[PDB]
Design a protein around this ligand. Structure first.
Ligand code: HEM
Ligand code: HEM
Ligand SMILES: C[C@H](O)[C@H](O)[C@H]1CNc2nc(N)[nH]c(=O)c2N1
Ligand SMILES: C[C@H](O)[C@H](O)[C@H]1CNc2nc(N)[nH]c(=O)c2N1
Ligand SMILES: NC(=[NH2+])NCCC[C@H](N)C(=O)O
Ligand SMILES: NC(=[NH2+])NCCC[C@H](N)C(=O)O
Ligand SMILES: [C-]#N
Ligand SMILES: [C-]#N
Ligand SMILES: [Zn+2]
Lengths: 419, 419
């Protein structure tokens, strides 16, 4: 059996069978639907005290091995069987197991492919993987991270990449990045009460300050890298400025846009998620793609809880800023998005508009149903923050489910860390 | 216990306990989340052959009675108990029961209040209820419907109202409106292949034609009323033109907007849903509110599957219509929304912009948690089709669940009708 999915923009239908591979449980009860919750337990993978129990690890590893050998065009049964047996014995004798380089590479791409909230998965097969499972010290992490940033930025020609640090063992020697993303701006709560910079990073910025970092009280101060190696206490690392590429904002027609003094970094790199594969868990695996215009223009700049610049852009456009019914927000928000796209393109920094991204995803989704009868998708995250109905993703029904490999969230490290 | 709900725009939290009253099951499995499905079984109430079984009716009626008497500021226990006993005996002796006028009025408002996909529920206590449970013929339905339209339009000063026809008995004498809404435009598939008018009503328009209605092949031809009384075959009824108020579209700055020849009706009136209360089911209960700018400007006019006018508005604004990345759609869509709001306001027809509606709902939601610890809400339907992130509803987490009384969908009558 399957699940019928229809696209109201074209009356097209699809049959989802891939949801049968659904790991465990999502976060919607039998009665209620918690589909709009941002960080539900179902999407989180928390700390540990002892190694993952064999009874549960062994079966997961078997699934992944089979999954891996089942992806080849031409099967290699003999190798398939040899690997199963080996892993089985290893887990049974050592209490865990190591992945081969090719299994890890496959896993990082499948996890990306299974990320329901990612709009850019059509790029899933193009992923540079940096194997840092050898790493043991904070300084070495720092180095791997710097190499990653340098490779991924590629002077504006953004390249998708991921760096995998040592897998979790007993959970008391976890490798962790305490940062939300590799590159982010600091947020400071001034005496008067006002916030300076990015309000979203207040807790973290305050944390860095406690760890010895010198607050520069700027509006766009790149935060430091806070690294945790082998369950060891976190160490602060300033990011070499040459490595951080930034785009200064200017509108193609409004010369006063420049006067706002806005700028944003070119590399979006989630640094705090956990990669799960065949029972193994990697709590440190920073990855990056390239930006979608609306993340910066709509969310980062316009979100009331972020740089909240709408009001100002409105006045400067001379709109009825005090008459909500005039739709001034709609006008300003569009001019901000045009500036963002224009700026990235003028400084040759890879970037994609939400319409193009939307049409792109729709192509990926079709390929997916056509390749494996399914494609986990979170409608709420996949529909752009503006122009929703104008993009095809809006008219597409979709099912959301957790597969494996998968990128899970984690509890903020500073809340579960034994100092 | 409860469920923690957070608003990321203000860090505010709420505790949902009202979800405990959740009827049966939603449409999200234990593993998968079908929260983006438009017409899931969980939201539909289909046909019948025999009267609703006592074993299940009696308990529902008891719940509703209790619910009704529990809403008074000052309890009336004696009356509470008298009513329970009476209903109990009636169901036990007649196989069903009748609601009092006040119970019905309460029920229609609670059902509105429990409609998770409605953005305008802050108006829930203001509802004109027309009791047509006495009705027996198609012509009488037609009359009630005409009275409803006349009262609700109120020459532009739109008033919310609902007309309740006879409740379902054995399911073989159902009263039904075959129309999507009371007032809608016809859609015609021309020989060449092109569609004329509203594509969304092709199946229905074709149906009317089969029933004898004369297709005027226009672009804005008000469809006829197709009424079903007492399980009797449907009868076509032209709507007196004087009763149908229409707004002609013109932009406040672009004189060429008028040249597009757009117009829309002033009364949005869902005509095909089923009202469920204490086990009883009313398959005929047309209701109406007033419009939200985006329903007409964004969905009705811009939806590719509807009047699809974006491209044309784009050319006429001289935008790079062939460069998706230019964000021309974003610009056109805004000008269309301004025309719609401007037009309704110039002709004094009640209407609300999506920002105001959004802020309004957020106020309702707060009152609700504060009044009964909950408020079923469908994020996917409550977030406007454009400017999503710019409205506060977007940053509000919410839970979706089916309570009772409730407005359910139904299977198109022409698919389950015994001619
Ligand atoms: C080709 C470039 C890519 C684009 C255009 C893209 C775009 C996006 C966007 C728009 C989001 C939403 C972020 C937000 O709302 O804050 C997202 C989420 C996500 N993407 Fe991608 N992505 C890309 C590459 C990647 C890569 C390389 C991976 C992993 C290997 C990935 C994994 C995910 C995950 C796990 C999320 C969820 C993030 C969260 O929940 O906070 N994406 N992506
Ligand atoms: C005060 C005016 C009202 C406003 C501004 C309002 C607005 C809306 C909007 C924007 C929708 C979405 C329609 C769509 O997406 O196609 C909706 C849905 C809904 N509203 Fe309201 N509403 C109002 C009055 C009412 C009334 C009087 C009732 C019932 C007594 C009601 C019941 C519902 C229901 C059941 C839905 C779901 C419709 C569907 O699923 O197709 N609304 N409303
Ligand atoms: C409450 C709601 O879940 C929340 O605001 C979501 C909505 N959709 C989103 N979609 C994306 N891509 N990113 C987000 O941060 C959000 N926030
Ligand atoms: C597929 C998806 O459920 C569908 O396009 C929904 C999204 N949100 C909506 N929201 C409202 N108000 N009305 C709609 O018709 C829809 N369509
Ligand atoms: N396109 C991406 N890879 N986005 C990752 C998350 C970035 C986040 N929206 C900031 O800004
Ligand atoms: N505001 C309302 N009552 N809307 C009811 C549904 C109308 C539908 N969006 C058309 O157009
Ligand atoms: C995607 N990050
Ligand atoms: C609301 N209709
Ligand atoms: Zn759900």
């Amino acid at each position: 059996q399957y699940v019928r999915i229809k696209n109201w923009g074209s009356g097209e239908i699809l049959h989802d069978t891939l949801h049968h591979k659904a790991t465990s449980d999502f976060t919607c009860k039998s009665k209620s639907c918690l589909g709009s919750i941002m960080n539900p337990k179902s999407l989180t993978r928390g700390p540990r005290d002892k190694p993952t129990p064999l009874e549960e690890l062994l079966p997961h590893a078997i699934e992944f091995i089979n999954q891996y050998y089942g992806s080849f065009k031409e099967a290699k049964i003999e190798e398939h069987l040899a690997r199963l047996e080996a892993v089985t014995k290893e887990i049974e004798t050592t209490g865990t197991y190591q992945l081969t380089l090719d299994e890890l590479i496959f896993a990082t791409k499948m996890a990306w492919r299974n990320a329901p909230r990612c709009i850019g998965r059509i790029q899933w097969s193009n992923l540079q993987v940096f194997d840092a499972r050898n790493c043991s010290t904070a300084q070495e992490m720092f180095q791997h991270i710097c190499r990653h940033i340098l490779y991924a930025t590629n002077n504006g020609n953004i390249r998708s990449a991921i760096t995998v640090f040592p897998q979790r063992s007993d959970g008391k020697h976890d490798f962790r990045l305490w940062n939300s993303q590799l590159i982010r701006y600091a947020g400071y709560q001034m005496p008067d009460g006002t916030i300076r910079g990015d309000a979203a990073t207040l807790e973290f910025t305050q944390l860095c300050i406690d760890l010895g970092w010198k607050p520069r009280y700027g509006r766009f101060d790149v935060l430091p890298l806070v690294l945790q190696a082998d369950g060891q206490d976190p160490e602060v690392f300033e990011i070499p400025p040459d490595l951080v590429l930034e785009v200064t904002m200017e509108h193609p027609k409004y010369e006063w846009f420049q006067e706002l003094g806005l700028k944003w970094y070119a590399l979006p790199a989630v640094a705090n998620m956990l990669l799960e594969v065949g029972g193994l868990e990697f709590p440190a695996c920073p990855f990056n793609g390239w930006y979608m215009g609306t993340e910066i223009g709509v969310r980062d700049f316009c979100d009331t809880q972020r740089y909240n610049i709408l009001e100002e852009v409105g006045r400067r456009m001379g709109l009825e800023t005090h008459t909500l019914a005039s739709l001034w927000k709609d006008r300003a928000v569009t001019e901000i998005n045009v500036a963002v796209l224009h700026s990235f393109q003028k400084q040759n920094v890879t970037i994609m508009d939400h319409h193009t991204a939307s049409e792109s995803f729709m192509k990926h989704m079709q390929n997916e149903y056509r390749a494996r009868g399914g494609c986990p998708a979170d409608w709420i995250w996949l529909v752009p923050p503006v122009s929703g109905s104008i993009t095809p993703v809006f008219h597409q029904e979709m099912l959301n489910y957790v597969l494996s490999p998968f990128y899970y969230y984690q509890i903020e490290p500073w809340k579960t860390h034994i100092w």
